[PDB]
Design a protein around this ligand. Structure first.
Ligand code: NI
Length: 341
């Protein structure tokens, strides 16, 4: 059964609620983004209206085979009427096609559902600036002050400078980047751009990337692995055994691997600066874990919420333990006392 924090009161709507069968009273199912924990349950046999971004709808049609007649893509930053209710989709600064959803309830209440997001000051000048928000359904993934990480721009600077140095020292080094979902494409695109290469990958991953409206993509990616010196592999293969095996397959073209695992946060964040990050090495294989996050840090989250000043917060992540829920509620009260709302 669908949990309460996936239901929008006063509407027929649910958010990211496709794994619960037919939800009683639901007339439209919203999907914030194409990540499996959120789409879990969709397929070609789904016959209710799904509302989403254009990019999300391209992925639904081509990857999950949802039929066209049931996909309802909406433009961003544009007031739309859904089953008698005004809605707006806003960029969530998460993965491609990810949105936040503003619902203007018939009784005057305004609700923001962040989906998954990485809060940014740029959001303070969207259509959120223009009215009061009563209830916030919040992505609380990193809601504790231990969760610090650098800007995406610092992490990409580190990756490009590391890759360019290695391959200029050794023109026979291969670069490998791990992936298992959409998101974090800047990692492998920025490294291939500094090296003058396309990114090589499996047909299934190429297909996924071609759904993303990324400009000039035909210029940046390929399925011809032999023509590329940046390869994409499943995240599970980014270990010494899987990388040794891959290097065998390249037929003596290369004699070294430099590999990247974009994680979110890891506890090596609480001690070390990005500048000081070092790889794990075994023979001619080195693996870097880089803290490229598509979720808010603690400080980014706190700034957003103190700017928005909601009347009520509903967490959507870390809700399964009493200790997590009590921690989050304590921070929400701090933020409200400090800011004065
Ligand atoms: Ni996500």
């Amino acid at each position: 059964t669908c949990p309460f924090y996936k239901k929008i009161p006063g509407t027929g709507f649910t958010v990211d609620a496709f794994q619960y069968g037919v939800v009683e009273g639901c007339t439209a199912y919203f999907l914030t983004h194409f990540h499996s924990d959120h789409y879990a349950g969709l397929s070609k046999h789904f016959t209710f209206p799904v509302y989403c971004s254009e990019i999300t709808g391209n992925l639904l049609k081509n990857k999950l085979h949802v039929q066209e007649q049931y996909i309802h893509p909406l433009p961003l930053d544009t007031e739309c009427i859904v089953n008698g209710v005004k809605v707006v989709l806003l960029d969530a600064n998460h993965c491609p096609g990810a949105v936040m959803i503003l619902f203007y309830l018939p009784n005057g209440t305004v609700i923001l559902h962040t989906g998954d997001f990485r809060a940014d000051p740029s959001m303070e000048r969207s259509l959120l600036a223009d009215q009061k928000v009563h209830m916030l359904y919040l992505d609380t993934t990193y809601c504790s002050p231990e969760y610090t990480f650098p800007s995406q721009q610092e992490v990409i600077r580190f990756a490009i400078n590391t890759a360019f140095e290695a391959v200029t020292l050794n023109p026979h080094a291969l670069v490998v980047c791990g992936t298992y979902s959409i998101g974090k494409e800047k990692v492998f695109l920025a490294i291939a751009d500094v090296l003058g290469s396309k990114v090589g990958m499996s047909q299934e991953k190429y297909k996924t990337l071609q759904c993303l409206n990324i400009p000039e993509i035909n210029s940046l990616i390929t399925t011809d692995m032999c023509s590329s010196l940046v390869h994409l592999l499943p995240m599970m293969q980014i270990n010494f055994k899987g990388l040794q095996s891959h290097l065998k397959k390249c037929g003596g073209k290369y004699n070294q691997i430099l590999a990247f695992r974009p994680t979110g946060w890891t506890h090596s964040n609480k001690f070390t600066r990005i500048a000081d990050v070092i790889p794990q090495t075994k023979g001619n294989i080195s693996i870097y874990g880089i803290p490229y996050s598509e979720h808010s840090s603690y400080l980014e989250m706190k700034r957003f919420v103190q700017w928005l000043k909601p009347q009520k917060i509903i967490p959507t992540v870390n809700v399964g333990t009493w200790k997590s829920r009590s921690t989050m509620e304590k921070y929400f009260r701090e933020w409200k006392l400090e800011a004065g709302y």
